[PDB]
From Swiss-Prot, chain A:
Changing residue 556 to A: Strongly impairs interaction with CUL4A. Its main location: cytoplasm. This is DNA damage-binding protein 1. The modification N-acetylserine is found at residue 2. The lineage of its organism: Eukaryota, Metazoa, Chordata, Craniata, Vertebrata. It is linked to White-Kernohan syndrome: An autosomal dominant disorder characterized by global developmental delay, variably impaired intellectual development, hypotonia, and characteristic facial features. Some patients may have genitourinary and skeletal abnormalities. GO terms for molecular function: cullin family protein binding; damaged DNA binding; DNA binding; protein-containing complex binding; protein-macromolecule adaptor activity; ubiquitin ligase complex scaffold activity; WD40-repeat domain binding. It comes from Homo sapiens. The modification N6-acetyllysine is found at residue 1035. Residues 387-703 are annotated as: WD repeat beta-propeller B. One of its GO terms (cellular component) is extracellular exosome.
From Swiss-Prot, chain B:
One of its GO terms (biological process) is protein polyubiquitination. SMART domains: WD40 (SM00320). It is linked to Cockayne syndrome A: A rare disorder characterized by cutaneous sensitivity to sunlight, abnormal and slow growth, cachectic dwarfism, progeroid appearance, progressive pigmentary retinopathy and sensorineural deafness. There is delayed neural development and severe progressive neurologic degeneration resulting in intellectual disability. One of its GO terms (cellular component) is Cul4-RING E3 ubiquitin ligase complex. Substrate-recognition component of the CSA complex, a DCX (DDB1-CUL4-X-box) E3 ubiquitin-protein ligase complex, involved in transcription-coupled nucleotide excision repair (TC-NER), a process during which RNA polymerase II-blocking lesions are rapidly removed from the transcribed strand of active genes. Following recruitment to lesion-stalled RNA polymerase II (Pol II), the CSA complex mediates ubiquitination of Pol II subunit POLR2A/RPB1 at 'Lys-1268', a critical TC-NER checkpoint, governing RNA Pol II stability and initiating DNA damage excision by TFIIH recruitment. Its main location: nucleus. This is DNA excision repair protein ERCC-8. InterPro entries: G-protein_beta_WD-40_rep, Rad28/ERCC8/Ckn1/ATCSA-1, WD40/YVTN_repeat-like_dom_sf, WD40_repeat_CS, WD40_repeat_dom_sf, WD40_rpt. It comes from Homo sapiens (Human). Changing residue 334 to A: Defects in transcription-coupled nucleotide excision repair (TC-NER). The keyword DNA damage applies.
Curated annotation (Swiss-Prot), chain C:
It is linked to Cockayne syndrome B: A rare disorder characterized by cutaneous sensitivity to sunlight, abnormal and slow growth, cachectic dwarfism, progeroid appearance, progressive pigmentary retinopathy and sensorineural deafness. There is delayed neural development and severe progressive neurologic degeneration resulting in intellectual disability. Cerebro-oculo-facio-skeletal syndrome 1: A disorder of prenatal onset characterized by microcephaly, congenital cataracts, facial dysmorphism, neurogenic arthrogryposis, growth failure and severe psychomotor retardation. COFS is considered to be part of the nucleotide-excision repair disorders spectrum that include also xeroderma pigmentosum, trichothiodystrophy and Cockayne syndrome. The gene is ERCC6. This is DNA excision repair protein ERCC-6. Homodimer. Binds DNA. Interacts with ERCC8. Interacts with RNA polymerase II; interaction is enhanced by UV irradiation. Component of the B-WICH complex, at least composed of SMARCA5/SNF2H, BAZ1B/WSTF, SF3B1, DEK, MYO1C, ERCC6, MYBBP1A and DDX21. Interacts with KIAA1530/UVSSA. Interacts with ELOA and CUL5; the interaction is induced by DNA damaging agents or by inhibitors of RNA polymerase II elongation. Interacts (via WHD region) with RIF1. Interacts with SMARCC2/BAF170, SMARCB1/BAF47 and the neuron-specific chromatin remodeling complex (nBAF complex). A motif (DEAH box) lies at residues 151-154. The chain holds residues 490 to 747 of 1493 of the full protein. It comes from Homo sapiens. Residues 30-200 form the Helicase ATP-binding domain. The lineage of its organism: Eukaryota, Metazoa, Chordata, Craniata, Vertebrata.
DNA sequence: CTAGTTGATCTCATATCAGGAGAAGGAGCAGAGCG
């Protein structure tokens, strides 16, 4: 058996469905977005969207509709999963806590049935008397709702029309009436049935069948004043109410088919319609007294290619795209002088269909960096993805041995931090940093003979300084020191803390509380505590008055984070931490919900607790180990919120997203100290002090994965990296219509240089395929080599062949003519990139599409339609066949390791081929004889072959252990839920063996790695217990979710660890964790799960 | 195909699209593969073939010579040309070999370890594949034309057996009860087929020109009697309500079990609504059968459009189930074709015939 | 109210009155009703089998399961000596059943054919004697009876008697027998009873005899060859498991 | 009109050599066409 660990590096980003309604509360307007397995609940504010919850379904969300049963206060959510788990979910918020309770659940799969072509349709009666599901041909599954089920017992009604295109429930009908477009051999017709829940059968509909357009594909039920339906077809929009039959054939909608629609109003006087090109139309119903007088369609503008779109309010439309970035657009009443009313407000990153990718160690670091062909037709792009915050440094000053950083506004009028005070060993150094100029000057009011433990700007246009002996309150406006407080015993200050109003200093084992007032430093609260002081923070949070009411301390020999009551310095709460290393940093900070207290040790351990403004009680202890060196915490307010920064040998920016704390890495060497800085020239900038210098950089976003976007405006298909040439070869495809004309300026049409394929070998809308050479620094299209008319560039490999030293871009193509089903012609072109031009070094006309190429020990291994052949690169610079293998249906995927070739077939699924070099021919080592339709293949080890099935499954074949030795054994099975397009070795970061990344159609980037048997057994047992503890949203079983699933097979997973489920082990409270770890201690498993999370 | 690959790769089309479309294309391109052979072991005509439902690797074959052959359909050799070798065989020297023609053979659904076979020697034998020995024998008072185990019933393991008697025998392989009889037919039952959808729905076709759907739980006779006309010629049911104008010698539920295909010696194939037995009026043209015994024909599975492969004399006629359009005639046999069986994993067909051959039809390219 | 798997709401204020075996018997009867098959309540005397029948039919009427909105017309064929008892039992358990006796004593005081027509027209509960089934065997079997309960169904023990033929001339799937002993002398009686409740389950009586009765009795003698006794044991096991889901018999 | 009693009437159990003469079927077979 094989042991594999799958984890999600990037959650899916493609939006397959969105609905709006009052889900989170009766007064709120929610936007619920289904990304493949993630459900995102947003609240539609007057500006943007404020996320409230993001839950992960154990299922691909196929249907998602909000409905309000009689008596319900707020909307319930119906979700159907691709595996046919139906659930009705309610949002129950109990104060701070947010829950998604499963009001009902079930599994609605018929044991047999032809899953319908058009796909799962799920509709709800507008009076919530039933949910209709069209899952299979010839059946219409009904889940009644007036009968309060908890199991959603569903019954089939035999639907005599076997090919139903779309169906909706009509409005204003005494009984639940479905209206559906169906296809029979005589054409497409719209028919209506009334569903009788008591007779559990259909009845004659209100209005007879009507013969409609040949491609009538969408039905829109129109609300109560009008009723009836609007059938959208390819060329016409028709309206039916039983006697009224309006029809328009707007020429403007003929260019592309309308694929999503949405009702802007409640009475349906206006509909948004999105087509496959990204146009957005408004369909208007003009009423007459009420009946409907006439229909109008007008083109609002352009958006991302919408899968779904939702009208929120005030003209704001959420454009849900599977192929591009989703957009949040606005509808203005008037045009923008270019004919468009659509104005994009926001763009949500979507690594669209990741069709190919490479991990390049670009920037010559030790870190991989994915470069993905993301997106599609108009939305095509290259996305560059790395696990780093991105220092983005602008200046530096070489100042050795820094021990302090604080921003200062030396100029009184300016509110900007245009000065920095620094402490090194025993003195104070001021820096002016005026604009971009940086210099070392002395500021009035600061002692240069004593160290600065702390200093900062305070209220009353005042500064304050805490040195090792005294505290000096600098009156910036009038003159030098006027208020100074000195410890009565002339004891040195061991720790300091201060905010905009007050002060707390530690002298030995005693604490002093000082409050800053104009020309006054008044001591109020004082005590001499049990042990020495270690670290402090009194930063007010949610201040609202001018003073913080609480205090946080760290003590010696009783290693613990204590809390104190500020006016009296009594002991509020104690959490014991332990260890032989004293606390170093203590900070309290708001993270998106409430107050958290962050305390760190000298070994990189760091503890975050949930703190309250009344009691000051630390709850939900969770511990996280970052770094191997002491840490300090500094707070900086970015655009969105406060993002605390952790300074250590492993600098790490801490903030919280979606009401959970996460640790984003910063990828420089080391950071002793940091402080925020917003100078006239440096906005929201940082100042990272290390042992040597002070780097002054900003950080772009802190999302763990930084995603650059290189818009191509054309569908990219393949990508390979040529290091010697410092470029990416990207096969792209753009759609031109007519001789031919580009519909838009794509990256291929806007290259520096260009060229066209002039080949002597072979003698509506069409796809033009190009080879783009893209600079790997600036990502500009250095060159665009257009391929022949009707030539599809499929594969692209970069390699050096034979013995010549040149590195070649080798493209495999096929000739596509509409008269044929399989290319009979194709060619392999060898290009060399030099002098900014792309010369054609060689060609080889082959007799099929070259679906895949891999360079194979200096030889070229191509897979023409069903044959896999090996080419040799002769000294003459031409490709010469060496050996063939013909035993394939269609060799689509090829991988290589040494002498072994893994051939993924279209439907025979893997064949381990070996090139036996002494003879010069291939030999079938083994084959997996199951009929798995491949989407990709990979080689993990000398004897493990990963494959991705087209039904969203991963399987691992293994060379077994006579003729039964020719049977590869599927030792691993796992339902991923994503359609994997690419595997590739590499990892995005600097216990587990190997690392294979993969990209999916939905934008998931996942990572497969091998575990050992010991680790695998341990984690499988934990996996079972987390299933016993974690409660899934639809009460779906994890085992069922990860069960290998195909229409003719279903097995429980095996040999695979869902790393996602394991890594959820950190997101649970201590009692539940203790329940998980019944039969070694929990902190040990934290060691394991942390070490596991580091691999991605 | 490249458009299909790109649409699958970019998510425009569900992968179900590529599976069903390409499977349909392969079925339309189904052609006699001389690049594959089945080892000739039957001295007489092959009456029946049955590929196992799970893993589709092994096939059974019963001949008129009374022998059973168990073939391997996987290319275990590294060449592109191979012969489907005969793994096992109940030959003339096996002590339990059938004395007369093996008319039907069926793998036990849910597992490959057991299979049952019926003969004109008035026996339904249950064989343990591993030991290749009979585990049970059901003797009947009259020769068996067809037997069938429900492909779907996880609960009951009844074998519906149609013999020359007017009654349909139900034999429980779970502890042995071959007493239950479904009465209501008037002549030999030439075909029996359990619904793939409902555990307890059994369709039985007889030489009295009637097809009846039974609910074997029910104690009150047939659910429905198939009627050619649906009521245009209506009579008090004593002789009317015939499914065909001759003997009905073949039954086959469509893949989803929502329709039933019956072929009769009136040279017609009809498609019926399996819930209310209503003729769908699909034409199918003329389907030549003059078989005096059960005619085993199959349907396709997992394609965009369903197909039916019916023995048409010496050929296999391929039709679209829901439109009647004859796709094609596969012509490679020398005598009448008795049975065809569909390998749904690769859209392959195997057809046996009275010429003592089993021909594999593989998709071309 | 107690609820079964598909939904059969036997009322709580009746279901609570039954004993555990009685509730098991009601469950078994309703499983038969779902399978649309008949059975034999072969529980010996004194356990109470009428209580089970009225409880099950009352639940089937209140539950409104459906053909017929709830329970349709049912005929109970019992010996004369218990007919009045039956009506009283109904009237004390489930009053709203319009129960009526077909007898010379009776209460109709008009033509008996009119009584059959009127009772069937109201989906009533009609009680007869076996003799009336035999005599009016053509008349009484025209009104689409939904249930047939042969109380003391061992009157059907002879597959030749005219009462057996008249009782097997009913058409409903629902045939229940309340007999303290399904068989009394030999297996002829078991075959006759099973031919009543389920026409097809056991084979034609020749087949049944030649397979079961002769081997069992031949293995019931102590001078039988070992093969004979082993075959008798096997055939008895086959008959037992064949009749297992349709004969509910409980001892003391 | 109403029971109650009393015969008839019917159903269901439990036993194990000194004929002859003609007509119709059938079988062996010779021979003639004839594909």
């Amino acid at each position: 058996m094989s042991y594999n660990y799958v984890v999600t590096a990037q959650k899916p980003t493609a939006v397959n469905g969105c609905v709006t309604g009052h889900f989170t509360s009766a007064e709120d307007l929610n936007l619920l977005i289904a990304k493949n397995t993630r459900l995102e609940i947003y609240v539609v504010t007057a500006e943007g969207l404020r996320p409230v919850k993001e839950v992960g379904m154990y299922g691909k969300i196929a249907v998602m509709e909000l409905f309000r049963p009689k008596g319900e206060s707020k909307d319930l959510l119906f979700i159907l999963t691709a595996k046919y788990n139906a659930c009705i979910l309610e949002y129950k918020q109990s104060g701070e806590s947010i829950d998604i309770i499963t009001r009902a659940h079930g599994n609605v799969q018929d044991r047999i049935g032809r899953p319908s072509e058009t796909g799962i349709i799920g509709i709800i009666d507008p009076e919530c008397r039933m949910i209709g599901l069209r899952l299979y041909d010839g059946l219409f599954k009904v889940i009644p709702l007036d009968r309060d089920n908890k199991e959603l017992k569903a019954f089939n009604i035999r639907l005599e029309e076997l090919h139903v295109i779309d169906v909706k429930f009509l409005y204003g009908c005494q009984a639940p009436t479905i209206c559906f477009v169906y296809q029979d051999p005589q054409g497409r017709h719209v028919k209506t049935y009334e569903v009788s829940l008591r007779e559990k059968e259909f009845n004659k509909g209100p209005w007879k069948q009507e013969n409609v357009e040949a491609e009538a594909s969408m039905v829109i039920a129109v609300p109560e004043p009008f009723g009836g339906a609007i059938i959208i077809g390819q060329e016409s929009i028709t309206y039916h109410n039983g006697d009224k039959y309006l029809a328009i054939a707007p020429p403007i909608i003929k260019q592309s088919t309308i694929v999503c629609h949405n009702r802007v109003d409640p009475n349906g006087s206006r509909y948004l319609l999105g087509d496959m090109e990204g146009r957005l139309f408004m369909l208007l119903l003009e009423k007459e007294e009420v009946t409907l007088k006439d229909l109008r369609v007008e083109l609002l503008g352009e958006t991302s290619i919408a899968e779904c779109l939702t009208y929120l309010d005030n003209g704001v439309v959420f454009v849900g795209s599977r192929l591009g970035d989703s957009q949040l657009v606005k509808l203005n009443v008037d045009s923008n002088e270019q004919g468009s009313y659509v104005v994009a407000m926001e763009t949500f990153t979507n690594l669209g269909p990741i069709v190919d990718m490479c991990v390049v160690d670009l920037e010559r670091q030790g870190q991989g960096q994915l470069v993905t062909c993301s997106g599609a037709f108009k939305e095509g792009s290259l996305r560059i993805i790395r696990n780093g915050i991105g220092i983005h440094e602008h200046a530096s000053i070489d100042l050795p041995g820094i021990k302090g950083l604080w921003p200062l506004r030396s100029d009184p009028n300016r509110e900007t931090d245009d000065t920095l005070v620094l402490s090194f060993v025993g003195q104070t150094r001021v820096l002016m940093l005026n604009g971009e100029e940086v210099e070392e000057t002395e500021l009035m009011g600061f002692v240069d003979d004593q160290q600065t433990f702390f200093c900062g700007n305070v209220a009353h246009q005042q500064l304050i300084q805490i040195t090792s002996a005294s505290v000096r309150l600098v009156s910036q406006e009038p003159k030098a020191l006027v208020s100074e407080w000195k410890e009565p015993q002339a004891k040195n200050i061991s720790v300091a803390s201060c905010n905009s109003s007050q002060v707390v200093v530690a002298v030995g084992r005693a604490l002093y509380y000082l409050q800053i007032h104009p020309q006054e430093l008044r001591q109020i609260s004082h005590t001499e505590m049990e042990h020495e002081v270690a670290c402090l923070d009194i930063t007010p949070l949610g201040d609202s008055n001018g003073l913080s009411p609480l205090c946080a301390i760290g003590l010696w020999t009783d290693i613990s984070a204590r809390i104190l009551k500020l006016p009296s310095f009594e002991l509020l709460h104690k959490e014991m931490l332990g260890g032989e290393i004293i606390p170093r940093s203590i900070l309290m900070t708001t993270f998106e919900s409430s107050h958290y207290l962050l305390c760190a040790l000298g070994d990189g351990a760091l503890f975050y607790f949930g703190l309250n403004i009344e009691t000051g009680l630390l709850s939900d202890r969770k511990k996280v180990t970052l770094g191997t060196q002491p840490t300090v915490l500094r707070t900086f307010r970015s655009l969105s919120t406060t993002n605390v920064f952790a300074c250590s040998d492993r600098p790490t920016v801490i903030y919280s997203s979606n009401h959970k704390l996460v640790f984003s890495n910063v990828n420089l060497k080391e950071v002793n100290y940091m402080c925020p800085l917003n100078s006239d020239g440096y906005p929201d900038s940082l100042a990272l002090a290390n042992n040597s210098t002070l780097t002054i950089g900003t950080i772009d976003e802190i999302q763990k994965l930084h995603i650059r976007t290189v818009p191509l405006y054309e569908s990219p298909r393949k990508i390979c990296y040529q290091e010697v040439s410092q470029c990416f070869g990207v096969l792209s495809s753009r759609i031109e219509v007519q001789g031919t004309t580009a519909l838009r300026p794509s990256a291929s049409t806007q290259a520096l240089s260009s060229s066209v394929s002039s080949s002597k070998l072979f003698s509506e809308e069409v796809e033009v395929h190009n080879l783009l050479i893209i600079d790997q620094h600036t990502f500009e299209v250095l060159h665009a080599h257009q391929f022949l008319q009707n030539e599809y560039a499929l594969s692209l490999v970069s390699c050096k062949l034979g013995k010549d030293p040149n590195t070649y871009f080798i493209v495999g193509t096929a000739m596509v003519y509409p008269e044929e089903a399989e290319p009979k012609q194709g060619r392999i072109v060898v290009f060399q990139y030099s002098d900014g031009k792309l010369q054609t070094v060689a060609e080889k006309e082959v007799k099929g599409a070259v679906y895949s190429m891999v360079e194979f020990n200096g030889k070229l291994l191509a897979s023409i339609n069903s044959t896999v052949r090996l080419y040799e690169w002769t000294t003459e610079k031409e490709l010469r066949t060496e050996c063939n293998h013909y035993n394939n249906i269609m060799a689509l995927y090829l991988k290589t390791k040494g002498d072994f070739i893994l051939v993924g077939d279209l439907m025979r699924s893997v064949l381990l081929l070996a090139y036996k070099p002494m003879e010069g021919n291939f030999e079938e080592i083994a084959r997996d004889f199951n009929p798995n339709w491949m989407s990709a293949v990979e080689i993990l080890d000398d004897d493990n072959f990963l494959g991705a099935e087209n039904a969203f499954n991963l399987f691992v074949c293994q060379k077994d252990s006579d003729e039964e030795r020719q049977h590869l054994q599927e030792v691993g099975l796992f339902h991923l839920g994503e359609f994997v397009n690419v595997f590739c070795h590499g990892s995005l970061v600097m216990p587990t063996q190997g690392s294979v990344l993969f990209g999916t159609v939905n934008g998931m980037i996942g990572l497969v790695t091998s575990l050992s048997e010991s680790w695998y057994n341990l984690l499988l047992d934990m996996q079972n217990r987390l299933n016993k503890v974690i409660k899934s949203v639809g009460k779906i079983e994890h085992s069922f979710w990860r069960s290998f699933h195909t229409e003719r097979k279903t097995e429980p997973a095996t040999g695979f660890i869902d790393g996602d489920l394991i890594e959820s082990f950190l997101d649970i409270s201590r009692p539940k964790m203790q329940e998980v770890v019944a039969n070694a201690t929990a902190d040990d498993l934290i060691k394991v799960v942390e070490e596991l999370t580091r691999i991605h | 195909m490249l458009g299909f690959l790109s649409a699958r790769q970019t998510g425009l089309e569900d992968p179900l699209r590529l599976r069903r479309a390409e499977s349909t294309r392969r079925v339309l391109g189904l052609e006699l593969n001389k690049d594959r052979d089945v080892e000739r072991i039957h001295g007489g005509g092959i009456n029946t073939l049955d590929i196992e439902p799970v893993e589709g690797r092994y096939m059974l074959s019963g001949g008129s010579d009374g022998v059973i052959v168990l073939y391997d359909l996987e290319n275990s050799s590294r060449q592109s040309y191979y012969t489907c070798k005969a793994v096992c065989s109940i030959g003339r020297d096996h002590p339990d070999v059938h004395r007369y023609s093996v008319e039907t053979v069926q793998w036990y659904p849910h597992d490959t370890g057991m299979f049952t076979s019926s003969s004109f020697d008035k026996t339904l034998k249950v064989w343990d594949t591993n030991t290749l020995q009979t585990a049970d024998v059901f003797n009947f008072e009259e020769t068996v034309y067809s037997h069938h185990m429900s492909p779907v019933s996880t609960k009951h393991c009844l074998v519906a057996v149609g013999t020359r008697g007017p009654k349909v025998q139900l034999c429980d392989l779970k502890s042995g009860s071959c007493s239950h009889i479904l009465q209501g037919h008037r002549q030999e039952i030439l075909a029996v087929s359990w619904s793939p959808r409902y555990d307890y729905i059994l369709a039985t076709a007889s030489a009295d020109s009637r097809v009846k759907l039974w609910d074997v739980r029910r104690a009150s006779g047939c659910l429905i009697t198939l009627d050619q006309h649906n009521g245009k010629k209506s009579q008090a049911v004593e002789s009317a309500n015939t499914a065909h104008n001759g003997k009905v010698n073949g039954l086959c539920f469509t893949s989803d079990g929502l329709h039933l295909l019956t072929v009769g010696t009136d040279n017609r194939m009809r498609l019926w609504n399996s819930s209310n037995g209503e003729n769908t009026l699909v034409n199918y043209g003329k389907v030549c059968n003059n078989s005096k015994k059960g005619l085993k024909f199959t349907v396709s599975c997992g394609c965009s459009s369903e197909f039916v492969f019916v023995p048409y004399g010496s050929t296999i006629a391929v039709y679209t189930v829901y439109s009647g359009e004859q796709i094609t005639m596969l012509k490679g046999h020398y005598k009448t074709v008795d049975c065809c069986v569909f390998q749904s994993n690769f859209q392959e067909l195997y057809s046996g015939s009275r010429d003592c051959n089993i021909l594999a039809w593989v998709p071309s390219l | 109210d107690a609820e079964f798997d598909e939904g059969f709401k036997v009322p709580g204020f009746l279901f609570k009155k039954l004993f555990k075996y009685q509730q098991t018997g009601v469950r078994w009867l309703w499983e038969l009703h779902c399978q649309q098959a008949g059975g034999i309540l072969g529980d010996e005397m004194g356990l109470g089998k009428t209580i089970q029948i009225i409880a099950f039919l009352a639940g089937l009427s209140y539950s409104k399961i459906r053909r017929f909105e709830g329970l349709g017309p049912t005929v109970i064929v019992c010996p004369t000596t218990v007919m009045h008892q039956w009506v009283k039992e109904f009237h004390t358990w489930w009053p709203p059943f319009r129960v009526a006796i077909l007898h010379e004593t009776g209460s109709y005081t008009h033509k008996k054919e009119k009584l059959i027509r009127d009772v069937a027209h109201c989906h009533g509960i009609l009680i007869t004697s076996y003799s009336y089934i035999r005599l009016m065997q053509d008349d009484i079997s025209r009104y689409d009876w939904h249930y047939v309960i042969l109380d003391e169904g061992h009157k059907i023990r002879n597959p030749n008697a005219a009462v057996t033929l008249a009782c097997k001339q009913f058409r409903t799937p629902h045939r229940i027998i309340l007999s303290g002993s399904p068989m009394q002398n030999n297996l002829r009686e078991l075959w006759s009873l099973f031919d009543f409740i389920f026409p097809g389950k056991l084979g034609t009586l020749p087949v049944f005899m030649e397979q079961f009765s002769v081997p069992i009795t031949m293995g019931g003698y102590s001078n039988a060859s070992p093969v004979q006794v082993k075959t008798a044991y096997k055939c008895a096991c086959v008959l037992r498991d064949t009749i297992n889901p349709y004969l509910l018999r409980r001892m003391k």
